[PDB]
Structure 1
């Protein structure tokens, strides 16, 4: 179990991405590593990759998998994230019989909103031993949309091209206003050829209640101690084609704090369209006027380009036709 980090040779480390990264358009940076393994290495030896706290490796959730390093079709090393957030790779028995091994590794890295608190420049740094790479990038977060007492901010946190999935978060009432009888709907962005498939089989939804608006930062981060899972209290349905509906039904029939809706859905691999979505928050004000406010999220399901050029903005939809009723397709 010798830490041979300093014994690796021909080491290269790099950070690749555009000058601007868009976390809510499934944007991420690519961390790359290259190195030659000394022949003295044996099964059990390890090496450490220094990871900056500003990034979340391989995914936006804690369950993201650390990819193994390969040698031909054999696993060269298996990695794990330690208590410091760094990655520890442990060599397999491949090094016991193979000499002159040269390896590479690329891991997508997402912006960690807990450590990047608002739109601005951030200096990213990663490395192996004394071989480090640095890059300053501009991280962009859009302010939430607000129409009367209805505020909303939708996102697309990441997509998985091979498994045809995507993860989206919708921040309901980030402004902390008073909303009576609120309802959230998620549709395909209208008049577009969206590739999303929204239904009971393809869409998993969880809802969390935030203690207060003050607990939601400009990068939309909420400390785990300030939100709790209330999926049991809302009514989730899919009343129309490719549309989900979340009725909050709180005890007072009013919400005064933000709510986080996490959507894990799927894409139609045979669709030639992009992942285009429109989220709409409905609600009454004190004067019982039923209104609706939307937010559009769109990203190309190409994977080729990191991100950028997508869509992440507010949209005022045609207001509801009937009070208390949602629209099958929120246009305008």
Structure 2
């Protein structure tokens, strides 16, 4: 079929919300009517192209589904399906392919409503971004403000436990049940002794989470951070970033699976911030994926002043 953006016009475009916190499940929606201004055929299509600051999938990962996100059928004003839809993750583009519906009609009107999320990689810091959206080769301009809850959290003491994490990818479609999670260890970059980090696949009750953390279910990569001021607030973290120095190999014997659904990591005496990239799995119970990361340590000088800090995450499976 042929690209018919030049025959499709979108109108009364709306963004539901233009300020939100993607670290507390903030998101938005775009809505629009569209009308087909000329004869189009079944299999012809128009597109919507998202800007740097947005994604159509958010924290749902489609890398195990050909990197393509299924989208609910587009309806005509009369309630029937006018087009099949998919969202391409790489090009951040929705493709709406007209069905046989259009073969017998003129004056075709429809409408769509689509959730929108931050792009944690391209909008890694809190602030205001352009969010200009291209529908059927027309711009609909917007500004978006992300107030990311800060990943920099912990006990308010110069020697206190401090750590946070965020689940930034859950594969809900393929059946493989994978997830991606970024953990910042010591984001305050304090001087800490006998530091231990625990990555749990549950929070308080093990049977209330689909999380599955074990030596066969979980892979960890650990990075020493060079310049902490370049770390994201979105929790996005590129393992090939030169501001990170991988030290996974040096941890081959500092990682233990001593308890059910928990990875224990022996950081020891540290003076740096670390990034722990987690690749996990969750089970088939239908339960929410709840996680909890815990850091405990002492004062590196006196070995006293013990502190512990914990951080919860939760995404639906």
TM-score relative to the length of structure 2: 0.68
SS of the residue corresponding to residue 6 of structure 2 reads helix
- C-alpha separation in 1, matches of 2:96 and 2:144: 30
1:231 aligns with 2:248: yes
Superposed counterparts of 1:209-288, under 5 Å: 209-220=224-235, 224-235=241-252, 236-248=255-267, 254-270=269-285, 274-287=288-301
C-alpha offsets along residues 151-181 of structure 1, whole Å, 9 cap, x if unaligned?
3122233545565554332101212233345
1:31/1:109 contact within 8 Å kept: no
* 1:297 and 2:315 aligned: no
Q: Partner residue of 1:319?
A: none
The corresponding residue for 1:206 is: 221
> Of residues 127, 150, 154 in structure 2, which corresponds to 1:145?
154
Structure 2 gaps of 5+ residues are 75-79
How far the C-alpha of 1:185 sits from its partner, in A, is: 0.5
Distance 1:237 1:81, change over 3 A: same
SS at 1:157 equivalent: strand
- Stretches of structure 1 that go unaligned for 5 or more consecutive residues are 303-332
Pairing of 1:104-119 with structure 2 (within 5 A): 104=112, 106=114, 108-112=116-120, 114-115=122-123, 117-118=125-126
**Match of residue 69 from structure 2:** 67
Deviates more, 1:289-298 or 1:171-180: 289-298
2:77 aligned partner:
none
| Alpha-carbon offset, residue 194 of structure 1 | 3.3
Distance 2:44 2:189 in 1: 52
With structure 1 as the length reference, what TM-score do the two structures score? 0.66
Alignment of 1:129-168 (within 5 A): 129-130=137-138, 132=140, 134=142, 136=144, 139-142=147-150, 143-146=152-155, 147=157, 148-160=159-171, 166-168=179-181
Q: Residue 203 of structure 2 corresponds to which residue in structure 1?
A: 189
Q: 1:170 maps to which residue?
A: 183
Residue 4 of structure 2 corresponds to 4
Q: Any idea what SS the aligned residue of 1:214 has?
A: helix
| Most deviating of 145-154 and 187-196 | 187-196
- In the TM superposition, residue 258 of structure 1 has moved relative to its aligned partner by 1.8
Residues 1:174 and 1:97: Cα distance change in structure 2 (over 3 Å): same
Contact 1:23 1:111 in 2 (8 A): no
Size of the alignment, in residue pairs?
Answer: 292
CA distance in 1, matches of 2:81, 2:188: 52
Residue deviations 1:46-83, cap 9 Å, x none? 5442323222342457948343565799984665467x
CA RMSD in angstroms comes to 4.3
